[PDB]
Design a protein around this ligand. Sequence first.
Ligand SMILES: O=C(O)c1[nH]c2ccccc2c1CCCOc1cccc2ccccc12
Length: 150
Amino acid sequence: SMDLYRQSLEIISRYLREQATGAKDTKPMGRSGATSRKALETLRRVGDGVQRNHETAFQGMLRKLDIKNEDDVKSLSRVMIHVFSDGVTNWGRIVTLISFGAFVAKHLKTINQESCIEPLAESITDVLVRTKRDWLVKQRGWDGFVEFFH
Ligand SMILES: O=C(O)c1[nH]c2ccccc2c1CCCOc1cccc2ccccc12
């Protein structure tokens, strides 16, 4: 679903960008927007907690990935689909996929690869919506994400 993709892209890319810069983007978003703003707000709350709770694991995975350049960022999808497609599907695992994206985005700013944050956000959005389309539709997309963590 291109609507699920374009909404997910805006939520993920906004969170990854603002985690990297340290500054939040202004309130107006694209289509839907009201649901997306609520989703970004719950994502900041839950996602910041996940980064703190899994700091050692995130540090370990970052080291393993050994990200140095733009080519390393594109080779990521291979591990991303491996780890994320095996096992159960729930909102906690979706938050973990996104929060680790934020953790990687901060590292990219550090190594002067900030231009890779958008392609990375795009890659996460694509893997998420492509592999979990039906489950996301059943949960009423980003409306169900907000409700679940309410
Ligand atoms: O779901 C889980 O078990 C799990 N465990 C982890 C333990 C550590 C770090 C993440 C995870 C996850 C998230 C899914 C897989 O994420 C990824 C894997 C690889 C590269 C990535 C790059 C950008 C964003 C997500 C990535």
